[model samples]
Target: GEIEFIESSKDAGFPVINTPSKTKLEPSVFHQVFEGNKEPAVLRSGDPRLKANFEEAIFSKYIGNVNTHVDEYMLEAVDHYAGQLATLDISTEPMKLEDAVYGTEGLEALDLTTSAGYPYVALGIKKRDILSKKTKDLTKLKECMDKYGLNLPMVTYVKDELRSIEKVAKGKSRLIEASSLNDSVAMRQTFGNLYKTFHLNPGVVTGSAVGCDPDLFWSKIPVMLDGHLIAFDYSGYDASLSPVWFACLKMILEKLGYTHKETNYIDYLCNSHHLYRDKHYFVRGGMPSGCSGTSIFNSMINNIIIRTLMLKVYKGIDLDQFRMIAYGDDVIASYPWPIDASLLAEAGKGYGLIMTPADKGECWNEVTWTNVTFLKRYFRADEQYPFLVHPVMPMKDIHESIRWTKDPKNTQDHVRSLCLLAWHNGEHEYEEFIRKIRSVPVGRCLTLPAFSTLRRKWLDSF
Candidate 1:
């Protein structure tokens, strides 16, 4: 069958790589996309450390350096499964129909004859969008997911890292995932219940700071999941999640009791469909940006990889006081005494992940650098207690949210919600922003209740 494709167009900011046409889908055809086709702008602003880490050679070693791997075995395996998929249809069995969608969705998307994530090695990539074509492919992939995912119970959702936040001319731009339907469905169906099954704790905050009272400030130090970049901005082509990288991961998955069937299926699904033409032979070093399963696959690999190292590094330390917890990619290792922060970062090199503040970084007890940020709240070093965690003023987070809002409904909800949080935390720093938002003249104006309790507490300060 033929597929419509888009090569880079001058209109899309690059020259014509391939003229728009109906490209043939062949068993041997592969798009060979070069590494770093679309690089982000300089990270000179915002967090300079973010840029420094990406620049550091050792830091980028696992992801940066690599030889193109051509596998006859992989090529054959993918074709064999894909062939079986082309003729199969199932209506019986549990999640039998759910398993196949993950693969089939991309396979259907395979027909999109557009510019590859395959561009002039520059910024912004484009794809051909045909609703009819995408929908048909979604149907096919959904069938595939369910047929293969029979052993697993279906799940509601899977956290997808299909989108990207690119470095822009100014602050940055979050490129939304134009991911199709059924990607998340099949991912959840296959591996969504992994946290409970694998047994990890919630190391990050849920809801907002005011909401997590029972578990507030639980951990002292935070560990980022991906290398420098958050999950959304993860570099897909970096060697981190490549076929070769999976070797170290296979053993870890086994140690953690991820079944052979589950692991094998996920591996196949991840590797087979996301194709980038490195000039014909589709080459890849890691999971692509559009795959929903990447998030699930990544967190499992990243969480276990880091947590296991922490376990050994802090082996002799007291576990009772220095508790370790994980919530997806957010992990925290709490400690009252000074800890060797380098121990964690240095060992992480083996797995291609890195932690920030890789020095005598901070614990509640780090002498020179006492305060630490975790789950977005400032955990101030304390004298009497271990630490006190609270939100910071003008909190760039709050400003960003306020700035990003265009609709009055959204503005009202966000402003009110933040005010309530500050009120509960017995804080009033957000009062000005809240008032500013209410004073605005929008189609629908914001209505803020008299913050009697919050203001009375503030009145005493006056």
Candidate 2:
């Protein structure tokens, strides 16, 4: 006997489509709204029963009675996602493939704008925390309600209507309906939680501001021309030593045994201080000749040395798989196959990851998942060949700034120095200095991460 669409979703063999259909699943809303050229639904302003709530919540608290940031941010996010939406083939809707197709919708539709037939969500009481405090004011809220065309009792009605659409889109796992109208608020909260404990933010390490902060100083203690002494005290300013100086201070306090210390020798940097003064090293010219400074010259050299050493001792040995997706720890790899779901300990121990999709799901789950679609859309899966092999390397087509800054022969080295000093000291001269460089537009060949569109089109299998 054959199975039904909802009944046996060929996914992990879990058959759970036991409900009546309200309507046949047409092409996913993602397809209808983004891929095709369907015009979006219109939203008119002005309402009556929404009077008191609007007066209090919308108008009174906010100044000048306008939300410029929300308007702009939403529009930008909507457009970004919508444009990406054009790339998908939503002619069919399959549940098993939904995860591979659209990660969380919040991440997908982050950029497109609201158009008609556009599936949307109206927030209920539970979501009010995401709204602006200004809206909580009555007078301003009333003004907004009047502008949007709503009544006190009818707010619920309008909200319910929108909810129905949201339910359909979300329930069928098609379009992502945002609970909060201002999605920036939601995204900020989400990403904020991510950075709460993980101190992964970028610092002034790559440019002239090297040794300016504690983190940068410690990371580069040994790579020097700043002299042999590494010094610091809990007190105030210690101009003699840079941030790297005290890192060694912290290290000595943390580790006492020779084996613990000798495993990785930052002391090499201290010994090489003379080499830096004389410009002895070839790659990126040794190190800073004076007090600690930032330069891709220093960054590249130090980054390679430290990373290579770390890789030699630590690579492929950790319980977790490691894939260097990009230069700055933009790693993303998963546990190995036959996931021993039982002995959680074994799950952590024997897992290995490859560049391809371990499980044939959406692009998001895949290594090459595009930002537009969470699914790994880079190299599509063909029916003839059900298995997919994720590229061993990351696609190089990158943003222009990264490409220009990383070129080996580029004067980006000097320019970065000027930019850094200008940034840290608030020097207007340096700002104007860097701006002039920016305007000149150094044209160079596009490399990995900066591919030509013509070339990308040719290379893409999608």
Candidate 3:
């Protein structure tokens, strides 16, 4: 249940919900500025609380020079992982792997729009090339599967009947059926248990990665460069070439008693997708946008590489002095000293990630990292906040939703649908929309008590 508040409550301060709890809302300048609006348009420069002095900051002071020793150490660590990755044999035929996991329906739905020049691509990674990589020689992978007698349970693949031409053009997206008994769901249980065996450090929390509060970790220990916090984020981290490499996944899984056979099946299931617009089809290897395994596994590998680089390889920094906070591919590292982005850029390139220094001051900066500026503030306040503000939904996304509504009646319906969406997403205040809709349903959905009940039930851990 969501908390319901009237338009009159718009002036309320922090702790939007007033309930007895272990965590009490503390007054902060950020809450005052936003005024219960989750996504405010701007952050005023005059605000003294945000620490906006970039000109005299330590981060600016240390930008030019690269530490040779640190560079050598990072490269050395990368080579170690690269060597481990090079040893992996990805000989499993992609189509064969697909057949084993997805069966006939998965096979038929697959349209190789390669003929149409829009080749099957998932996460910008070519499916054919990844499939062509040899996994047949993975002896360790085979051994693990046999020992565990692992098998993937049946899961259905279905086409989104309402999918449009524009969406197909962008990339074929399909809906994976939801089920409690599905292989993907059941596999998560084993995945969760096995992940604990690794005992990896804090900072990884995507998919099945460990459970750590990134907000708490980051807010408590951010990298301070003279009073200014320095944060680095990756662009297109999931679609980036670095996150898809299977070597690290193999290594991590091997450590967790995972078999190559089961790993291969999981890998194939995650990677294979059929994007078809009419007869134009594309087969892609990288998991598409909503894949759970891709999000989890990629986060796991990226964090492992990043943590190893910072804590073990980079000799310049002391581990105790800094903290690393990550969710999926998004990462923020805090240290007392400054960071050389050039060296990090090079280091990240070696592993297929593009590390960009996130400037907190700029609002129109067209990068995913920009959201961190305000979202971090909200995250620090409510660790369990359901939705973190992202860049406004792209015009293409909105257009896709209304594309099918050509008729006047359908067009009106579309407008109404958008209105409901706005209210649900908390863009518009709750009360006005409730007045237009029925109060009974709205009360049931968003009453303050209902919100409290929902919060108490789902957010107990927080």
Compute the lDDT of residue 157 as modeled in candidate 1.
13
Tens-digit per-residue lDDT, 316-388, candidate 3: 5654454444455655554556555446566666654566666433322322322444222222223345332
Please report the TM-score between candidate 3 and the true structure.
0.41
Query: What is candidate 3's CA lDDT for residue 153?
Result: 18
lDDT of each: 0.35, 0.23, 0.35
TM per candidate: 0.49, 0.19, 0.41
Q: Give lDDT tens digits, candidate 2, residues 141-241.
A: 23333444311100101111121232222221111112122222222222322211112322222212221332122222223212222111111011111
Q: What is the lDDT, from 0 to 100, of the residue 406 in candidate 3?
A: 32
Put the candidates in TM-score order, highest first.
1, 3, 2
Residue lDDT tens for model 1, 255-320: 344566546645543343221111121223444333444433454444344434555566554423
Q: Candidate 1, residue 403: CA error in Å?
A: 1.9
Clash totals for all candidate models: 34, 64, 18
**Model 1 ranges with Cα > 4 A deviation:** 1-62, 65-166, 170-183, 195-249, 252-258, 268-290, 293-297, 307-322, 327-329, 335-337, 358-370, 379-394, 406-409, 420-426, 449-462
Q: Number of the top candidate by TM-score?
A: 1
